[PDB]
Amino acid sequence: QRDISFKFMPNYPWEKAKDFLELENSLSINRLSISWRIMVSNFEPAIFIQ
Amino acid sequence: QLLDVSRQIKSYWLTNSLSTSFPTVDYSEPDLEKVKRTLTKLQNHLLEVSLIE
Amino acid sequence: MQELYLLGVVPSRRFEAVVNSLSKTLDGPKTILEFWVVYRPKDVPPNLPRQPDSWLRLCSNIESHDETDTEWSKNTQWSMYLEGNSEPKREDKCGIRPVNRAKLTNGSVTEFVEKMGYEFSHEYIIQGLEYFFFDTTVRIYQTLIPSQQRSIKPPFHPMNEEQPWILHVYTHVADASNQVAMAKAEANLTKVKTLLSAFCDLKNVRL
Amino acid sequence: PVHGVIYYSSPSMATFLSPAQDNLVRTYFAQHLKKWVVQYKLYRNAVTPKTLEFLKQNINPSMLACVDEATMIDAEPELEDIIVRTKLWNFRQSFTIEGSIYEVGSFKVAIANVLQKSVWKGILFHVTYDGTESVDLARPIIQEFFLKCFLQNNKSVTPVYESFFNQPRHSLDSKLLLQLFKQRI
């Protein structure tokens, strides 16, 4: 809406599952981290938040 | 009375917990990589994604 | 910490039946492979130490290292058990054994114990399965002597030819004094014992 | 990052902690995080082998415990009970440190009293400075801030302490703390 550059970059646990029981434990997970990067302006250094 | 006894014996034999198996009718294949991809696809609906870093 | 225990014996052919059939009774089997070594106080002052029983033993989980390579006592996590003799006058009821334990990391466990002044006594392996009931475990194991000190995986030397298996029932109460918690652990042990007794007979013994 | 450990033994420093904290919060807008306590215990079996154990409360989960002076392992509190039950090791000797950690602008500090059985009131400080990790630049920023924030008595007394250094953890090594107790007896 306000035309700000950004990159999403999510890393879901179920991507990493070797087999199905792994997939189970993946869904059951208690917490996950999703790292964002946000460029406010071209000259301004990027500000990133997880 | 003999028939009662023989029945009891059959039942006992069948009561014994020696099955040690399951019926197992399997043979429909997981195709996990498809489930991963459909999961991600749904989870990122309407979302612009970027590369890892 | 107080542990309430029952135990029994299982011959070899009777082992396999007791196993599958245990899987039918209560919560499925967890593979357990343990390496144990004991230590002995070198000072032996005869009046008060009472070193024959109170001396300590310590062990650790070897889930998968020895099959892959030469066993690494440095690599695995270690824990130390002080288990005392069992309480007598308990012929009728379940047994009581006081046990205390601590987990040890970032150190030479061997060098630490011997620097205490303890010193090697015996070294044995525990191999078997354990099953679960609510707040009460049950492991069937066998006592495999190692081929060598810190023996590799291929050998697994067994103690006797008959190779009998041993049945241990686990229950833990933190607080010795609480009669209500002893009561509930007692009844949990009674109920599990009843079911397990249908399975096979087992009873309280000393230590 | 880079943190300094300072320590005082003057009796003025004795009375100092509570008003020091209070003034810190009030005047410099400190925020109070977890209270700090650590416990040191020292005894030795009938054959004269020293053993000592001490317990940071922050990371109590790992209790660090060493035989004589030489040899140490990380272990559980129940281990200590083990050694008591064996009775081969003799009776305790206890030091303790109690204070509380504050976060003030760009660094976090620990203000604590050291004492045995509430004997005395010699004060320990511990300032982790978020920033440069160059010991030579942090040492005078830390020193400057410490002076500024505790300057009333600052003319009046001088410390004995361990120099500041750079270490990744946000809390100071437990082994080092043992070394502080052992140089302190």
Side-chain angles (χ1 to χ4, degrees):
Chain A
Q1 167 64 99
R2 291 319 186 186
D3 198 86
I4 296 104
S5 174
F6 70 89
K7 278 164 186 164
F8 187 24
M9 316 167 54
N11 186 18
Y12 301 144
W14 71 75
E15 290 284 5
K16 183 249 156 183
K18 188 177 179 183
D19 61 8
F20 259 78
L21 210 165
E22 270 195 27
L23 174 57
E24 285 185 6
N25 294 46
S26 198
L27 306 151
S28 190
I29 192 183
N30 323 66
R31 34 135 37 77
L32 33 64
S33 179
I34 287 195
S35 227
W36 300 65
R37 191 193 262 150
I38 279 213
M39 346 278 196
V40 36
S41 292
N42 327 20
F43 40 94
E44 302 266 38
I47 176 195
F48 35 67
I49 61 205
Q50 60 181 21
Chain B
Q1 302 183 2
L2 247 39
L3 271 60
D4 299 350
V5 159
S6 74
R7 157 236 205 199
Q8 282 187 50
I9 299 291
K10 298 195 209 126
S11 295
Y12 272 69
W13 247 239
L14 273 52
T15 278
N16 112 123
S17 66
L18 192 49
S19 318
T20 318
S21 276
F22 301 86
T24 67
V25 60
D26 196 350
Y27 268 76
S28 185
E29 258 329 82
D31 182 11
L32 145 63
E33 288 308 327
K34 170 193 172 191
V35 71
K36 290 187 170 204
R37 298 185 322 266
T38 42
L39 251 56
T40 302
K41 148 194 182 180
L42 264 171
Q43 187 68 318
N44 291 339
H45 204 222
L46 316 337
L47 277 5
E48 309 194 341
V49 323
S50 180
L51 85 177
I52 327 177
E53 211 180 18
Chain C
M1 166 175 179
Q2 298 279 10
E3 140 191 306
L4 287 55
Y5 72 133
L6 258 55
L7 31 44
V9 304
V10 181
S12 295
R13 47 155 230 289
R14 241 282 183 145
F15 164 79
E16 187 140 32
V18 167
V19 167
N20 142 229
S21 241
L22 260 173
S23 160
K24 258 51 205 168
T25 51
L26 79 200
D27 202 330
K30 231 166 183 176
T31 324
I32 84 137
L33 185 46
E34 288 172 26
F35 195 111
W36 291 58
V37 310
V38 195
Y39 286 100
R40 182 175 192 184
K42 281 186 177 175
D43 313 18
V44 199
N47 191 306
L48 306 102
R50 300 292 189 176
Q51 72 147 195
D53 144 273
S54 240
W55 56 338
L56 87 183
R57 53 221 94 185
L58 120 152
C59 76
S60 48
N61 180 345
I62 343 108
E63 220 328 89
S64 49
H65 292 169
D66 221 333
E67 195 271 347
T68 58
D69 222 22
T70 128
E71 102 84 6
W72 298 129
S73 54
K74 173 189 171 180
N75 201 316
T76 82
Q77 323 171 27
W78 280 80
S79 291
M80 155 185 311
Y81 292 98
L82 179 272
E83 33 184 309
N85 38 243
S86 144
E87 189 159 330
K89 303 203 177 188
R90 263 286 165 147
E91 1 151 13
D92 331 2
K93 280 177 149 194
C94 76
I96 300 89
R97 178 178 69 157
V99 177
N100 290 28
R101 68 149 203 193
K103 304 165 196 210
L104 323 176
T105 34
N106 297 27
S108 56
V109 217
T110 66
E111 313 174 23
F112 186 104
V113 184
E114 270 159 343
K115 283 322 165 204
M116 303 270 304
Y118 285 101
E119 95 95 345
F120 187 100
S121 274
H122 32 301
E123 154 192 347
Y124 61 62
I125 303 185
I126 305 285
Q127 177 200 44
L129 310 179
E130 59 186 25
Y131 292 100
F132 273 102
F133 199 69
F134 306 146
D135 291 337
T136 171
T137 318
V138 39
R139 62 200 222 161
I140 183 167
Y141 62 102
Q142 240 205 338
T143 300
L144 271 57
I145 179 88
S147 149
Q148 297 159 325
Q149 286 63 5
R150 323 306 182 257
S151 150
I152 62 170
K153 148 254 168 194
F156 284 155
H157 199 278
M159 169 169 175
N160 264 92
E161 342 146 43
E162 309 288 65
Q163 313 263 346
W165 293 75
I166 169 63
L167 230 47
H168 207 342
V169 162
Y170 266 157
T171 272
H172 285 300
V173 303
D175 173 87
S177 62
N178 187 295
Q179 303 189 15
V180 202
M182 290 303 196
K184 191 218 171 180
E186 190 87 38
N188 270 20
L189 256 265
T190 308
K191 184 179 185 183
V192 48
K193 165 192 186 172
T194 288
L195 165 49
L196 254 197
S197 153
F199 218 154
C200 146
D201 45 36
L202 85 179
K203 226 151 183 182
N204 177 352
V205 317
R206 85 171 206 181
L207 45 82
Chain D
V2 43
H3 27 280
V5 175
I6 305 178
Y7 183 59
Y8 282 80
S9 264
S10 319
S12 38
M13 297 311 290
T15 296
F16 176 68
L17 179 142
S18 168
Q21 315 207 185
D22 292 325
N23 169 45
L24 176 40
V25 180
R26 175 177 149 152
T27 33
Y28 297 84
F29 306 175
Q31 356 189 7
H32 169 248
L33 297 61
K34 46 248 179 180
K35 299 213 174 166
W36 197 16
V37 285
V38 294
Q39 260 248 349
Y40 177 81
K41 297 185 178 188
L42 234 187
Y43 43 17
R44 102 266 282 164
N45 119 38
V47 80
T48 72
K50 203 171 189 159
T51 58
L52 47 156
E53 307 146 335
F54 100 115
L55 232 202
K56 220 151 188 172
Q57 132 269 94
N58 167 264
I59 184 42
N60 190 334
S62 56
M63 155 180 189
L64 307 214
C66 84
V67 207
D68 21 83
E69 309 177 324
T71 47
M72 344 163 299
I73 303 201
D74 313 17
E76 226 173 304
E78 184 102 283
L79 168 136
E80 110 171 57
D81 289 343
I82 289 184
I83 288 199
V84 163
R85 277 279 200 164
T86 60
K87 308 218 169 184
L88 6 121
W89 263 246
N90 227 343
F91 277 84
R92 251 136 203 208
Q93 227 305 82
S94 85
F95 282 144
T96 155
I97 312 181
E98 6 184 339
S100 341
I101 281 98
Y102 291 75
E103 173 186 349
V104 186
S106 299
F107 19 67
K108 314 169 178 189
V109 326
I111 289 203
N113 276 101
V114 205
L115 57 209
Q116 51 172 2
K117 296 271 202 160
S118 70
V119 146
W120 77 318
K121 337 55 119 195
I123 295 284
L124 173 142
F125 295 71
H126 179 286
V127 183
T128 73
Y129 168 83
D130 152 51
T132 69
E133 303 214 48
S134 179
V135 188
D136 298 40
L137 291 71
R139 136 188 297 129
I141 297 186
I142 292 181
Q143 284 269 30
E144 217 283 347
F145 139 74
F146 187 108
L147 184 151
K148 156 191 193 177
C149 287
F150 312 84
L151 102 93
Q152 324 168 291
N153 310 19
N154 267 348
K155 328 183 174 182
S156 314
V157 275
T158 75
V160 37
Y161 70 66
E162 317 311 283
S163 48
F164 10 65
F165 48 19
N166 162 250
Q167 181 190 0
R169 325 175 198 174
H170 273 291
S171 184
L172 59 169
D173 180 15
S174 294
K175 296 169 187 189
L176 176 131
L177 222 50
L178 180 154
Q179 206 65 1
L180 269 53
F181 278 93
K182 229 156 175 174
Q183 295 185 19
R184 225 74 295 114
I185 78 105

